[PDB]
């Protein structure tokens, strides 16, 4: 009669999450070949990347210099908060302003390279957004750890009604069903997935919450896939064949975090340890990080991320292409000629043995 | 027919047990500031504490120190048995006779600060009860390893016949519905959870007897909830994750063990191994507690527990600041204005995976 | 339609295995005391241990010595094979021939100490168990690894035919409630459980053949209960934890290896390491011991078993004391007088993350 | 009204998969000794074994002598394709010209040892294939990562409609059931079963594509097994339980790759480091080893193998030996007299704890 | 060379000599590097027994 898990409500354990590591993608009839597969995929409505990827707003790893970087790969950038308006302003008209190296740049209309800004909620970051959109940003990441309040719903919409058809409007995190739809509802062009996986995260230790990605990208489909609303899984990524799951779960674009962050083209000064080189990396919500602009991100002190180190990695051409190499190597096995091809793949799951 | 895992009765396994690290706290639609959450829960059914945090009742975690700084920062601390009589009626005799800056100060109708006392089962516990309850105690908690014997039921029994109007009464550790709903036919005021999973336990080694203490919260709220008799998750608890995750199962209250025992408030002597400061900190089963006031807690060499040393934290209120904090991100993810409404939020389960 | 593990047969995997590790006991009402529970347990159908445990037909493990000192403990002890029939025969005489120190002492009607013996499968087999009987012993145990063979099950019931009066016959491993119902229909007095378990036993490495404990113990008593024959769980057992959850899954007797063999009345000198005291344990199939009268064990060099060294451990005395203690805090915990009862009490399954 | 794991779709997550150390086989009633057991099984439809192991057709594995050593032991070797044409077929000419010391070896008509040879997919595979036969190869292998290519079924279907009366076609790597059944229409004489389990494969973690042994090798059975087309269990073997576990699911032949790295008749010269004896190991789609002819086993830089070193193991003999003693353990265990029968073995599953 | 022109005709010569293939003794394999044994005539493994006059001998 009872739960067997304990207690009378059977929706007192919501679901069984599952994470990156708990599938894999199984082989399906391929006539495709890996040098051809077509990897471009929607990032709004109205932009499309060549390349599916894209680099996360953190003042460890966008800034101008890696926003025009991302830009010529064929990804995007989207810039960070954590400094003042004119700084950020200042940025984006840098990369606005900045011939046949790069086939696969991402350009407006008028030729110039795209990039994306961050901003919070309040009037402060009302005053931001406006800023940015003068300045000539195209899309505006409604950054929030938790999207579903109902003041991140007010700017969206807020946004949306305003500079709505001169830019694009992304939501916050999110990690269910019911608070994709109230984000799609709000007018949202993209939503952008993910409550606590990340890597310098420590949101599932200082407060117990969270949602494994998978689950979390198979939910917020769910919900955005009827209405045609692109989805950014954001958080927990580490190698290409997670890349290739996460768009196998229906997510549109990858945004990265560390993997991007020990490149030459990130922000901070190369350090040496005992002849190896390494970059900083620190969260949004980490003490040093927060002792400012984006101590907002939380409603703020209780850290709620850590610093640390990565090695160096290079030039960042290198990286975005391994990670193409190895998402491209993923569609040739499951045969799929687009990315809304390999969004229909179906997965395996594996038990612990398989990780051990 | 016959059972998956072996025989033929599908009652021998009785059920799959979660512990802490099983579950995760899933994002509800949050219109809640962490800086403006009411953290206030019941301790027993007639005493309310600002901050949901008791201490435990072990000789090297709480005595008069450590009870004047718990009910100062909020809460509350239940003084030791390892001792004999008088001292501890000494101990109770100086919380209650002994400052602005605390606010949050827990105090009975005369403004004099709140504190618990932990009694045992048997004649001299009668008399240690009788004596305590003529010093001014405020609740007398039945400690045993095991509340489910009819001695422990007899004994809250006869307390609250005897003092219970003046005093509340805590029954010892359960871990399942019917020793909950037992207790509570007793007349316990307040029922504490948690039979195995203590950090210094040895129970599931020795006698392999133990129950994972999220299914076990939920067992005894189902069992308890129903009369309006409080519950205190007492054991495992690492994190303020962990908190708002035993919070969330079902229970008012968290008893707090290794987390509070490197504190200045704690007893003991520091210990300096490297440059690096340490306290001790010992169950009260292990062969050098029980060497006696707490021997007779098993009715008892075979020690059920053992000794180590916690790195030094500093001050209580910086632990509890920190850990009401981490409550404070997780009530405001979940959406939960209140502790009763954080009795309400849901889990995901996350597999082995999701711990690597 | 498929099986979700893959093909078509639903009994391909035929069942989910638990182990030790696996399970916890459930506390239930008690009215015991730890002090006066009565661990006095069936070994076969005739014979009543004051303390289920029996010593391993190892020639590491048991030899006079051990024999005399585990049936004084009120248990008992089984010499193993590996030498000549007149060296056994001699070391049987030896416990039989050898006042108030011991009160648990095992005895039969003449007072003198109970001992067993194991034997092989063959002639030379059959004359070392003629030699055996008219040596003294009480118990036959026919010590197989796989016993689910032909010749095994006809070599108990020649055993119960000739000798069957005078003492019992026990059947060797078992892993499955076939092999044990076949056992029982031979005559068997007593079922020996366990394939695979063993620690230093590589059959699961090595032929990828094996059963967790628990579940074999649940499905062999299955059979053997409705006819009265008692079951004896062989191997994995490293605490007095696992012997409490033998007991409970419905075993009558554990039998110990590796937690005996580092104790003084163990064969084999003490091997000094650092300044730390060690003794050899290995098992019967090892590649050592198998180059030989325990050759026969897997009809057989392949060696099934591997060489180590256990700490020493002291007087065999304090460890059946510890692992009694052990054992009656389990009863005391579940509410059981008897082994009876205690065969009769719950577990709950812990995940993964209750293991770490 | 969702699927637990997420979604609406309850096919995206097709299955759970399980690997080697996810089952144990369980005992059965046995009349069998393990030196008496037939191992011998079919390896195509034409070609049967008398030793059931056939060595990989990696540059690092198989060459004119561990084909002739493999003969010899009563296998098979499949000679790699990482060199030119005119050397493959002076491989294979050498194996074909190369006396009671080994009564297990395997000969054709004709007196000669077997031998099998590696192909690709193209013009310049077929041109290979053809001089290979020309040379009097016995079995030729279509060899590519991702056997459900359009191309690899029509390279399949043109081999044997050339060459199908004189040479056995064996088609590559699947892991599905469809992917068996369209290499069985196509006319394989058997089918090669493995994507991703490797040991010094990086398929799972550069692409994310895999696909574990246990449920793969069903699948591919289910497939197959009505058609009487052989499957071969290629990849994770690491002890001799998982080839007694592989041919319990199905499989009549598995295929060695690490477990004859370290032989002395696998080709490398030997590596000597602190008196210690390695030889090199890897992947034929590693960076190093693809640094033209086994380039394009993935439509190729993205290495998706690795390089790595393994102990000497010694004589091949030895091993093959060992490994065969392990199979006859199983094969007594479970009661099977012949493969055919242990294919018709049950499994356990065993929990995580098990693996600890 | 120095020995020599110090006024010595000859040098007898020990360790220098021990390890060669011709010398007798069990070569010894040490973390696949080749050794040889090389004891003076008073050591312990050598004295203890013919040629004990060799200090009218045990230290
Ligand atoms: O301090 C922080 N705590 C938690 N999440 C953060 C923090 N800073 C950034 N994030 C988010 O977490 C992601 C982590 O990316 P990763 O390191 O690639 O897993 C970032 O891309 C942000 O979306
Ligand atoms: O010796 C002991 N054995 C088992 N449990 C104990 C012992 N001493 C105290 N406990 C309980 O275990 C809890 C451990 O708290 P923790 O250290 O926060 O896990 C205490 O609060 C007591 O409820
Ligand atoms: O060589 C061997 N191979 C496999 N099992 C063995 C061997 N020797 C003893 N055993 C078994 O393992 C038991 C002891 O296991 P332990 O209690 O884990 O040491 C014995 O009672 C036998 O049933
Ligand atoms: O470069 C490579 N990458 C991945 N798999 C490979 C590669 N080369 C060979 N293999 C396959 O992986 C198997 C590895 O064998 P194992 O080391 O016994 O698991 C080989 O027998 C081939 O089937
Ligand atoms: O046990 C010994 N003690 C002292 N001198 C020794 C002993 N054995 C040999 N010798 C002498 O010492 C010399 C050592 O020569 P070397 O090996 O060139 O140093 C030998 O050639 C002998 O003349």
Not at 87 to 116: I, N, W
Not at 328 to 353: C, D, H, K, N, W
Request: glycine content about 12%.
């Amino acid at each position: 009669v009872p739960v067997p898990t304990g207690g009378d409500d059977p929706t007192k354990v919501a679901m069984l999450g599952l994470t990156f590591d708990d599938v894999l993608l199984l082989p399906a009839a391929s006539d495709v070949v890996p040098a051809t597969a077509d990897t471009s995929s929607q990032l709004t409505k109205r932009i499309r990347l060549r390349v599916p990827l894209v680099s996360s707003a953190m003042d460890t790893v966008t800034e101008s210099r890696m926003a025009i970087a991302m830009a010529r790969a064929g990804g995007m950038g989207v810039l960070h908060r954590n400094l003042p308006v004119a700084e950020q302003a200042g940025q984006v008209e840098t990369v606005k302003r900045s011939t046949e190296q790069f086939p696969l740049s991402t350009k407006d209309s008028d030729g110039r390279l795209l990039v994306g800004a961050a901003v919070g909620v309040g009037d402060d970051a009302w005053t931001r957004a406006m800023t940015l959109v003068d300045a000539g940003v195209d899309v505006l990441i409604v950054d929030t750890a938790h999207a579903h309040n109902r003041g991140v719903l007010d700017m969206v919409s807020r946004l949306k009604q305003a500079v709505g058809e001169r830019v694009d409007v992304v939501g916050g995190n999110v990690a269910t069903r019911a608070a994709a739809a109230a984000l799609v509802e709000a007018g949202a062009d993209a939503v952008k997935v993910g409550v606590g996986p990340g890597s310098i995260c420590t949101t599932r230790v200082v407060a117990g919450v969270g949602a494994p990605q998978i689950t979390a990208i198979l939910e917020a489909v769910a919900a955005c896939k009827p209405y045609g609303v692109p989805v950014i899984a954001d958080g927990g990524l580490q190698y290409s064949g997670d890349i290739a799951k996460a768009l196998a779960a229906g997510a549109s674009t990858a945004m990265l975090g560390s993997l991007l962050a020990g490149t030459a083209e990130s922000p901070g000064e190369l350090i040496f340890v005992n002849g190896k080189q390494f970059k900083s990396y620190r969260g949004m919500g980490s003490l040093g990080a927060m002792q400012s602009y984006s101590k907002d991100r939380y409603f703020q002190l209780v850290p709620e991320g850590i610093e640390g180190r990565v090695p160096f990695r290079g030039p960042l051409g290198t990286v975005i292409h391994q990670l193409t190499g190895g998402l491209r190597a993923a569609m040739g096995y499951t045969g799929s000629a687009t990315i809304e091809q390999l969004q229909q793949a179906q997965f395996v799951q594996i038990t612990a043995a398989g990780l051990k």
